[PDB]
């Protein structure tokens, strides 16, 4: 069925965008580690 | 096949819940920016 194939193609695109945002969040969450290390270093 | 259509409907629901938690994490991760700005402002 073309309706099923089109729905699968739409799900594949959503998962690709979801996977990209997770990798970005992982990188952005690494900043929060550096940001707290910078506050602790500059203060202490 | 109804089994394939039911599996697609289950995947669509899981992606909808996954997409909602990512947007929540993005908002909750913005708090961590404010929280570090509040610590740096109150201390420095």
């Amino acid at each position: 069925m073309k309706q099923i194939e089109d729905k699968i193609e739409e799900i594949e695109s959503k998962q690709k965008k979801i996977e990209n945002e997770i990798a970005r969040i992982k990188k952005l969450l690494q900043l929060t580690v550096w940001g707290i290390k910078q506050l602790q270093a500059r203060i202490l | 096949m109804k089994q394939i259509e039911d599996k697609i409907e289950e995947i669509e629901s899981k992606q909808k819940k996954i997409e909602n938690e990512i947007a929540r994490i993005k908002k909750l991760l913005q708090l961590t920016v404010w929280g570090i700005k509040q610590l740096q402002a109150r201390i420095l």
Partner: antibody, heavy 117, light 108 residues
Framework: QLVQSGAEVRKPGASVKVSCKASGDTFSSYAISWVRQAPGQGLEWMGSIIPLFGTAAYAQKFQGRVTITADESTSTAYMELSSLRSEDTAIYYC????????????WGKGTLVTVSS | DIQMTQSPSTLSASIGDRVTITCRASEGIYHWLAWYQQKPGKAPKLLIYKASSLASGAPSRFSGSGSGTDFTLTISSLQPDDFATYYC?????????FGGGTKLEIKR
């Protein structure tokens, strides 16, 4: 990718402010560090900003006379060094600390700064 | 802070040989270490991040290892492009500190 300001010449006891412009994607989820290298000497770290937080961490030997700022509206990073001395003459670089790697991937061309009378 | 000691400061080797240099930290830094290569009149170029993961464009002959305090950069077969100065840098905690530096000389 990383464009800096032109060369500068100052007198001792005076200050300087060097700019370094990056992309908008750099000012979001990345960090910029300032590293200098005297002629013939080795690399020496000075400080870094985490632009999305406004935090900064400087070096001990430079603590009190170094100031690093960054405005996200122009995506430019500024480095201000006060109480200049003759040994401060060095080539100052700006690198983009990449958190996923834990290292600096892109670098700038470097700026010729001379502290002499 | 954390002190990075590069031994040796200079090295003399010929093309095709294998060379091994170290970069010891004053305290435990896990895999946080970044190796660089600088040419005269050039900005440093990133080679190895996380002490093992090679970077983009870095040829496979380079090599990183070590964790905690003792680390090691090694090359399998030297080539004229490989002869330059190398600086290690830790990212465990601030302030970030570089190493002394290891200049690679062409033996003749």
């Amino acid at each position: 990718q990383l464009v800096q300001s032109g060369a500068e010449v100052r007198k001792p006891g005076a200050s300087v402010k060097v700019s370094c412009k990056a992309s908008g994607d750099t000012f979001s989820s990345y960090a910029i560090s300032w590293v200098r290298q005297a002629p013939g000497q080795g690399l020496e770290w000075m400080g870094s900003i985490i632009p999305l937080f406004g935090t900064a961490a400087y070096a001990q030997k430079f603590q009190g006379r170094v100031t690093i700022t960054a405005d996200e509206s122009t995506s430019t990073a500024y480095m201000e060094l006060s109480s200049l001395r003759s040994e401060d003459t060095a080539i100052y670089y700006c690198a983009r600390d990449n958190p996923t790697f834990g290292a600096a991937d892109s670098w700038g061309k470097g700026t010729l700064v001379t502290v002499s009378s | 802070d954390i002190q990075m000691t590069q031994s040796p400061s200079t090295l003399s080797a010929s093309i095709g040989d294998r060379v091994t240099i170290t970069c010891r930290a004053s305290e435990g830094i896990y895999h946080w270490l970044a190796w660089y290569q600088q040419k005269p009149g050039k900005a440093p170029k990133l080679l190895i991040y996380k002490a093992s993961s090679l970077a983009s464009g870095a040829p496979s002959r380079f090599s990183g290892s070590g964790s905690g305090t003792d680390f090691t950069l090694t090359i399998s077969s030297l080539q004229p492009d490989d002869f330059a100065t190398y600086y290690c840098q830790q990212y465990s905690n601030y302030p970030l500190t570089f190493g002394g530096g290891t200049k690679l000389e062409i033996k003749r």
